[PDB]
Amino acid sequence: SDLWVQKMKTYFNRIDFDKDGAITRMDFESMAERFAKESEMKAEHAKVLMDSLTGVWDNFLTAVAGGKGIDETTFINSMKEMVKNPEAKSVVEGPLPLFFRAVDTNEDNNISRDEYGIFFGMLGLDKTMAPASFDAIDTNNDGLLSLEEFVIAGSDFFMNDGDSTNKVFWGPLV
């Protein structure tokens, strides 16, 4: 699947923030303190950010190699075969509820268009690209991203191997 290797390589290249070459506890802890310090956000968020980022690795990404980090080969080999099972969903969908409270830079429990744009700026992207994913995630039509919207759009990007508007949940395709 061409669509699967393009969208899952998008997520691997955008989530390896620490640059060691593998998705491990180092990327989540390095991303929490570097995300809190590099852009304009509510100062207090570093403890909230370190708690949801340590929870995403400890409770969900950790179950892939039973403790140790994950390379691009092991991520594509393990996740491409595990998605063919209709009930393995929660090991791949589980990071969306804890990532929602990590991107919430204003301290409200709803993410806006320029907040999602500062998240894109930290990965190394332009704010003009953020509307293509933001407007595709806003299911209820409020002009903000709620918890239900973020989990529906991420569930489609991570498990449905089709095209449509929710195929860009992480910016430009690698």
Q: Which residues of 100-128 are buried (b: 16+ CB within 10 A; e: fewer)?
A: bbbbbbeeeebbbeebbbbbbbeeebeee
Residues 6+ apart with CB under 8 A from 94: 56, 59, 60
DSSP-derived secondary structure for 48-86: HHHHHHHHHHHHTGGGTTTTS-B-HHHHHHHHHHHTTST
| Amino acid identity, position 155 | S
| 166 has binding-site annotation | no
Helix axes 45-59, 95-103, angle to 10 degrees: 170
Ligand-binding site membership of 142 (annotated)? yes
Domain that holds residue 172: 1-174
Experimental technique: NMR
Taking residue 158's Cβ as centre, other Cβ atoms within 10 Å add up to 20
Residue 42: how many other CB atoms lie within 10 Å: 12
Give the contacts of 59 (CB within 8 A, at least 6 positions apart): 94, 98
> Which CATH number do you get for residue 149?
1.10.238.10
CB atoms closer than 10 angstroms to residue 90: 9
Confirm whether residue 59 is marked as ligand binding. Answer: no
- 104 labeled part of a ligand binding site: yes
CA distance linking residue 104 with residue 116, whole number of Å? 9
Say whether 138 counts as a known binding-site residue: yes
Q: Is 110 annotated as a binding residue?
A: yes
User: How many domains in the chain?
Assistant: 1
Annotated binding-site residue? 140:
yes
Tokens linked to 88: 């393995």
- Count of all residues that appear for the chain in the document: 174
126 is in an annotated binding site: no
58 annotated as ligand-binding: no
Q: Could you give the CA distance from residue 53 to residue 154 in angstroms, rounded to a whole number?
A: 17
Is 71 marked as a binding-site residue?
A: no
Q: Give 44's DSSP letter.
A: T
Q: Is 126 left (phi over 0), alpha (psi -120 to 50) or beta?
A: beta
The answer to whether 167 and 3 are in contact (CB under 8 A) is yes
* Chain-centre distance for alpha carbon 87: 21
- What are the residues whose beta carbons fall under 8 Å from the beta carbon of 102, sequence distance 6 or more? 32, 35, 48, 49, 52, 53, 56
Closest by Cα among 55, 62, 56, 33 to 45:
33
- Quote the CA–CA distance of 38 and 121 in Å, as a whole number: 10
How wide is the angle at C-alpha 116 spanned by C-alphas 111 and 121, nearest 5°? 155
2 is in an annotated binding site: no
